[PDB]
């Protein structure tokens, strides 16, 4: 996704958390989605004059190596319930017997 998400100067919008106080449940999204600052005044975008994110950021540069470019990862999870199956594929193409 170097031609999709990255830009000129580097994309520092994707970060990760070093340690979490609470525990995580399966199929649960973190409600803390707001980007906080280091002080009290928000910066609304780029960093400057002590508004840094305490979380660690990734290095997403357009001139970076093949092992450090931003890669969009989509994890295809699967589960089964009491309801019948609905999503399945692929099944090519047009057989009948």
């Amino acid at each position: 996704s170097n031609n999709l998400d990255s830009k000129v100067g580097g994309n520092y919008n994707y970060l990760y958390r070093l340690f979490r106080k609470s525990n995580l449940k399966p199929f649960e999204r973190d409600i803390s989605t707001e980007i906080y600052q280091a002080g009290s005044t928000p910066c609304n975008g780029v960093e400057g004059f002590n508004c840094y994110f305490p979380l660690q950021s990734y290095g997403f540069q357009p001139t970076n190596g093949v092992g450090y470019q931003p890669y969009r990862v989509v994890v295809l999870s699967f589960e089964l319930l009491h309801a019948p199956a609905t999503v399945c594929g692929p099944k090519k193409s047009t057989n009948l017997v």
Partner: protein
């Protein structure tokens, strides 16, 4: 007002050597993931340019001879090998504490090969 004592003041170096440019500072540390400052190169007859910001990220326009590391308070700019583009003054920029003071400056001179004047 923190007077960033930069050592040395002036030293004429030659090609293929290793120059030591030390910056003394105390503030600050742990911006977001590091505690380094900015480095610049100010020529007396040319507008300056940014060598490397925060001493850990990539930036074009700088030669490969500018590198180094430092502690949480003191820093060291290492020029190795010295090329014929170091006739300038170097400074360190405090980027966290107001006022954003600078270093004293290291005026390096180039001891290149001999050259005849234009006739």
């Amino acid at each position: 007002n923190i007077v960033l004592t930069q050592s040395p003041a002036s030293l004429a170096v030659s090609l293929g050597q290793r120059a030591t440019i030390s910056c003394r500072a105390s503030e600050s540390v742990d911006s977001y993931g590091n505690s380094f400052l900015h480095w610049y190169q100010q020529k007396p007859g040319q507008p300056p340019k940014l060598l490397i910001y925060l001493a850990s990220n990539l930036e074009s326009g700088v030669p490969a001879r500018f590198s180094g590391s430092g502690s949480r308070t003191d820093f060291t700019l290492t020029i190795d090998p010295v090329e014929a583009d170091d006739a300038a003054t170097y400074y360190c920029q405090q980027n966290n504490e107001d006022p954003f003071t600078f270093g004293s400056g290291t005026k390096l001179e180039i001891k290149r090969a001999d050259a005849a004047p234009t006739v």
